[PDB]
Symmetry: none
Subunit: 447 residues, 2 copies
């Protein structure tokens, strides 16, 4: 017996949570559900809202405090282990993470041998995707992939053709593909690119150069040095209309997604790349302004860290797929666990955070909004036990009474330390999930 | 044969000219002495003045009308190079106007490298200066300049001393200066900030946040993102007690004048910024009001625009100051050309304008007031002829006649096209000079 009016809300919250999950939705649905219930009893939608927010801030802290850290390769490997359901894969990720460090570029690649192989190379990644989604090549992943690409680096906009075709020709005359990173690519240069690309006459991609202004020119310089090319900036005697392939950097493979370009390989001497690396260590030392050291460490990281490449073997392209996926997922989990740490999954951490909300003194509407969150904190667990075909109220009461870290495991069915068991979660994820559920829920009780 | 009187008065005028704003001074003197003779011949002040005012208008629409427009990077470049006495400069500014766009912010600082530098960075200028002039650090330029500051955004009034202590404590702890932008900064809060600045204890500036109510609160948030800071509010974010330096935003430099605040190089995540600019473009499209719309789009033009910096090849001395104040003039002066156009430089475009006065209602005293104007229009060129040592009336008569758009030069001594010959003024400038003079003259007539 579910109230029609609540059901219609339920579905409006779900159809939203989609766009911005399973935890977050079930968690939102609960919040909104208790929301409408108290809004109907004459309660300020706003007061219930701010009250929720305070509750969520407080639970957040409590979750970040009571979070098991993940630092040793050994631990790290275990986290990735779970995320992929394979010890072999987690160890290879932990290896890679150790080599290039937790925050390093770790891509995964379709090897033709079989098994699982780790290789390191140079390259870097920046948060700038393709200009047009028409530059795409693997529709399912929504990525463009160039192979043995020439790299055009331009410190201005590109929109004419009169300066493009000189270069373009000389590049198709090599039967090589091309990545161009410029201030921007505007139509007549964007369309000549996207078009020749479908004609199949010319494969390529265009990406907005990262940053703004002068730092932007230094990051293009960076890329030239890490690619073996020279930045095209007519301001210093280097015409676009006049450029032999000599001015373009090369690499092994480029990969552009909706928001990040990855170059893999080089591309400039070990000398030059060392030179740049040092010079940047210099600026770092000779600066007393913290911003520039931030942005410098940043440039350094990409330039110095290089790229870890995980190689996977297979025979069905579908397996190659499922594999690439599984690994990629384990990476992002690994990285997230190394940042706020890790916590018992199963929705137990959340349901056992509820009693932290008594340390909170609020009055009326903001106090109810707090107690609403307190009830929602159990939704994820209760929801799981329901799919498990167990008794929601009943499981919420057999867990509300157990050691901090133990609850229902729907794999075995055996109430145990869920952390032990490898039912865990990166706490970033549990904290994100609550926060969104609480924005969504807030917005609802207000619009 | 100078008149001790007209002399004693031309002199008095020159001083009232050195007040705000020299073409105007010669104009104002010409209007006043001519205006005096006539007053000393019966003619009424109020009458002549009123007349001058109406006579100036006419000369205005006319000067606007005879305006060679400027759009292109060529033209624009050309203008600034004149007003700067360099063509590197001209270009460098025309360039600077290419990038940040035409009505964007273009800052000039004195650097220590040699080649005048164009750096683009994130940043912002808004229309509010220092709450108090005691924050001034360069007393010549009436400016407060702050290096590597920590910026504080507060959507409420700051008055209370105690409220800030826990934050100020932490900022003195870093040797960094602080720019505070609140609803206001008054009372013991204000004096405390000031006292400390005089002492040397602590380097700050306090500025009022722009606009009102909601719309102010939104711009604050804009400043927040552009800087990496978050707006301290008592409705979303937390109290001013137990605040962290991570809350503060930062930038390479803040310039606060009597009128304005520039934030150079905000320390914000370039993509955080981009994202917000997005949020605004959306708001614009969803906007139900053509008013709500123009506001949003200038907010947007501030974020996305950033700030052109120009560094002054130095090496090495007081020249770096002069050199700065010139580059600056060449900038407000190109921004000005574009906006209204250019005209016959020299003292010319003004002269040839007088023939536009006759189309008025030449009646009584106001008839004469206007007749005074047609006279002073000669003044500009007059003075110049007086320098290279010519015959005012002769040079003046000849030029008075030469086909619309030609006149004499200074280095050139050639009655040739002077626009082409490269000698010109922003209309606006020329229009302002006359308008000002008349306003001076305006006094000497009514008052003693
Ligand atoms: Mg300066």
């Amino acid at each position: 017996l579910e109230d029609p009016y609540e059901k219609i809300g339920a579905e409006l919250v779900k159809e939203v949570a989609k766009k911005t999950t399973t935890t977050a939705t079930v968690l939102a649905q609960a919040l909104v559900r208790e929301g409408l219930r108290n809004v109907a009893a004459g309660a300020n939608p706003l007061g219930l809202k701010r009250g929720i927010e305070k509750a969520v801030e407080k639970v957040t802290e409590t979750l970040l405090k009571g979070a098991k850290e993940v630092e040793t390769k050994e631990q790290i490997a275990a986290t990735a282990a779970i995320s992929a359901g394979d010890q072999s894969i987690g160890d290879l990720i932990a290896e890679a993470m150790d080599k290039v460090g937790n925050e390093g570029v770790i891509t995964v690649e379709e090897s033709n041998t079989f098994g699982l192989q780790l290789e390191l190379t140079e390259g870097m990644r920046f948060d700038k995707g393709y200009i047009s989604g028409y530059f795409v090549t693997d529709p399912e992943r929504q990525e463009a992939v160039l192979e043995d690409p020439y790299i055009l680096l331009v410190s201005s906009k590109v929109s004419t053709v009169k300066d493009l075709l000189p270069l373009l020709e000389k590049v198709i005359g090599a039967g090589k593909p091309l990545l161009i990173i410029a201030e921007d690519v505007e139509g007549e240069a964007l369309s000549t690119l996207v078009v020749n690309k479908i004609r199949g006459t010319f494969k390529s991609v265009a990406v907005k150069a990262p940053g703004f202004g002068d730092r932007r020119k230094a990051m293009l310089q960076d890329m030239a040095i890490l690619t073996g090319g020279q930045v095209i900036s007519e301001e210093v005697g280097l015409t676009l209309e006049n450029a032999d392939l000599s001015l373009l950097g090369k690499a092994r493979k480029v990969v552009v997604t909706k928001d990040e370009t990855t170059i893999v390989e080089g591309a400039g001497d070990t000398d030059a790349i060392a030179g740049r690396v040092a010079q940047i260590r210099q600026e770092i030392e000779n600066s007393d302004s913290d911003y520039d050291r931030e942005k410098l460490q940043e440039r350094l990281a990409k330039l110095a860290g290089g790229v870890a490449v995980i190689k996977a073997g297979a025979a069905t392209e579908v397996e190659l797929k499922e594999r690439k996926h599984r690994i990629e997922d384990a990476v992002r989990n690994a990285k997230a666990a190394v940042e706020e740490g890790i916590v018992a999954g199963g929705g137990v951490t959340l349901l056992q955070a509820a009693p932290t909300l008594d340390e909170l003194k609020l009055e009326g509407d903001e106090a109810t909004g707090a107690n609403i969150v307190k009830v929602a904190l159990e939704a994820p667990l209760k929801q799981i036990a329901f799919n498990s075909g167990l008794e929601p109220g009943v499981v919420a009461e057999k867990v509300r009474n157990l050691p901090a870290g133990h609850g229902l495991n729907a794999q075995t069915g055996v109430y145990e330390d869920l952390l032990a068991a490898g039912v865990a979660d990166p706490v970033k994820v549990t904290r994100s999930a609550l926060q969104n559920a609480a924005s969504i829920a807030g917005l609802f009780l207000t619009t």
